[PDB]
Amino acid sequence: SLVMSSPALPAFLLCSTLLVIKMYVVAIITGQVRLRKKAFANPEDALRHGGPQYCRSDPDVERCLRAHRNDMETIYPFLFLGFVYSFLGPNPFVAWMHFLVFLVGRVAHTVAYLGKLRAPIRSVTYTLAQLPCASMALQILWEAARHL
Amino acid sequence: SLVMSSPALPAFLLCSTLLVIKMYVVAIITGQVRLRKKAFANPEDALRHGGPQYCRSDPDVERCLRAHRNDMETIYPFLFLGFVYSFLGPNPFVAWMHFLVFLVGRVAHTVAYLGKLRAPIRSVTYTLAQLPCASMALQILWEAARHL
Amino acid sequence: SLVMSSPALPAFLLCSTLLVIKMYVVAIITGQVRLRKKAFANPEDALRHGGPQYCRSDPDVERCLRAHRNDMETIYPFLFLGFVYSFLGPNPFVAWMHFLVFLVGRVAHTVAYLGKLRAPIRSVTYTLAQLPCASMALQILWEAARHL
């Protein structure tokens, strides 16, 4: 199998796919909140679900959208950086640590966001998860630059 | 050519590039709607196009932005999942079907969204397109996990 | 090193990683603006930073979010298109030019957006940067289609 193209690749693919699934979970939760709170973004949706007054904003729907947006601001860059980093021959354990810190930090971020946990818990989880991303980005920069 | 690195890859690259172009079409439509409805997001834009009163929201611009955001929530994960899945040696026809269902579902989603089609047409197209994404994600999970 | 899998790859990886870092800079700036203007998105954040009245919108925070969103609408597609394009055996100089126009255009876009530069400076930088993206997308389409 081509999953063994590099020793770090299986770990990267596991963490990254779990994070994609975690984003899908946020999308599904958002839909559930829209239904339960009757807060739809579109008149056509609202008319099917009780009337035009249900095309409206809701603070919990907005919170779900913020968590999903923050995921897009961070997880998408990781999918790129982690893939490239997997092929730079990093120490297997060190690579695993980078991916695991990102995975745990991001899952914790969504829990802290949707769970409305006290500040600065969410901010700390965000920062933690970005650390391995910064590390991988710098490593890629050096490797790319030196091959120019 | 390296497009033949796997039998499923050409189909994946065709569908994924068409979807990127489809996102670009949404960006261009959004700009056209801003101009036609004189609804700009920035004072500097509004002042060039008739006055400060034209820095304002518009329901059709907001709808375009929702479609584009939903694209980012779904097409970007597909670009990752479909690329990896192409290298897991899937049945060629089965892979083609996964990519085609996603392509058709997503094009239909944008038509249903921007066309203001009755509910639940958009919701159904969304769900349809996510099915092959869930399928690919699970397959990647098993392949990655078993190589740990 | 696997960075030399294709002659264009090091240049692509350099430009793409710099652009990811540039997105991270926008995220950090956004946080600084939230703090300085006391405009937080969440009640839990506001209560830590002076009171519930500080959960509020701010035009500069909104502008930062627009720049970051526009980045997600454009840089993420580039990460995909440029990666694939690097493996289609393009002329090295021509490829470098595609990546450099995108890099310069996007950095200029963020400067024009956050700097509130007069129209149509931002719109021009956006258009410039999209040109190589359109070019790469078409090239990928032909290469993928002909291998079906």
Ligand SMILES: Cc1cccc2ccc(N3CC[C@H](C(=O)N[C@H]4CCO[C@H](CO)C4)C(C)(C)C3)nc12
């Ligand atoms: C992400 C994902 C991944 C994998 C599979 C997925 C399958 C479905 C799926 N949806 C997202 C939530 C969405 C939703 O709840 N929308 C509500 C608001 C508008 O009105 C709707 C009709 O009443 C209900 C749903 C169930 C229609 C489709 N998402 C998926």
Ligand SMILES: Cc1cccc2ccc(N3CC[C@H](C(=O)N[C@H]4CCO[C@H](CO)C4)C(C)(C)C3)nc12
């Ligand atoms: C996505 C894509 C892909 C490939 C090539 C592309 C080329 C351009 C291009 N734009 C997106 C729409 C955008 C727009 O219509 N903005 C209006 C609102 C603000 O004010 C503007 C100046 O009056 C008009 C435009 C034409 C300036 C640039 N997009 C592209």
Ligand SMILES: Cc1cccc2ccc(N3CC[C@H](C(=O)N[C@H]4CCO[C@H](CO)C4)C(C)(C)C3)nc12
């Ligand atoms: C992108 C990136 C890349 C690499 C490393 C990074 C490290 C941190 C980092 N943050 C983004 C900005 C964010 C922020 O300023 N938020 C303010 C608003 C809410 O309240 C906060 C607590 O008072 C302050 C911060 C510093 C907590 C975390 N970003 C990073």
Ligand SMILES: CCCCCCCCO[C@@H]1O[C@H](CO)[C@@H](O)[C@H](O)[C@H]1O
């Ligand atoms: C990957 C998806 C993670 C979902 C985490 C959801 C955490 C929800 O947690 C809940 O949050 C509520 C406030 O929103 C509180 O009232 C509840 O006490 C708490 O259980």
Ligand SMILES: CCCCCCCCO[C@@H]1O[C@H](CO)[C@@H](O)[C@H](O)[C@H]1O
């Ligand atoms: C604001 C703090 C966030 C930045 C986190 C820095 C991550 C450190 O990253 C490290 O950088 C070194 C020098 O480039 C490299 O030699 C290491 O391989 C890399 O792990």
Ligand SMILES: CCCCCCCCO[C@@H]1O[C@H](CO)[C@@H](O)[C@H](O)[C@H]1O
């Ligand atoms: C990939 C881009 C797909 C663009 C699909 C646009 C569909 C527009 O469709 C139009 O929608 C209008 C309401 O918005 C209706 O008034 C019109 O009858 C209908 O033709």
Ligand SMILES: CCCCCCCCO[C@@H]1O[C@H](CO)[C@@H](O)[C@H](O)[C@H]1O
């Ligand atoms: C809520 C319903 C959405 C989930 C769609 C499930 C997609 C099924 O996906 C299937 O999963 C099987 C078991 O892992 C695998 O053996 C198959 O290869 C895979 O196609």
Ligand SMILES: CCCCCCCCO[C@@H]1O[C@H](CO)[C@@H](O)[C@H](O)[C@H]1O
């Ligand atoms: C990659 C990050 C680029 C950051 C570019 C920030 C440009 C800020 O530029 C500043 O903009 C202000 C208005 O916002 C003006 O008042 C100042 O004159 C100007 O210096």
Ligand SMILES: CCCCCCCCO[C@@H]1O[C@H](CO)[C@@H](O)[C@H](O)[C@H]1O
């Ligand atoms: C609206 C204008 C934006 C579109 C920019 C067009 C970019 C041109 O792209 C070119 O297309 C040719 C034909 O497919 C190819 O032969 C070239 O390799 C490619 O560089």
Ligand SMILES: N[C@@H](CCC(=O)N[C@@H](CS)C(=O)NCC(=O)O)C(=O)O
């Ligand atoms: N887009 C972000 C940029 C900065 C950021 O990502 N901050 C982290 C830590 S405070 C966060 O969880 N932001 C909440 C959010 O993005 O909604 C924002 O507006 O806050």
Ligand SMILES: N[C@@H](CCC(=O)N[C@@H](CS)C(=O)NCC(=O)O)C(=O)O
């Ligand atoms: N961000 C989405 C998450 C759920 C979702 O993607 N739902 C689909 C089917 S109802 C959709 O088309 N949502 C419209 C949208 O994202 O604006 C939302 O707010 O609805």
Ligand SMILES: N[C@@H](CCC(=O)N[C@@H](CS)C(=O)NCC(=O)O)C(=O)O
């Ligand atoms: N989502 C974009 C789509 C069109 C676009 O990307 N336009 C460029 C050039 S005018 C832009 O800088 N838009 C500003 C923005 O996205 O906030 C929008 O709403 O304008």
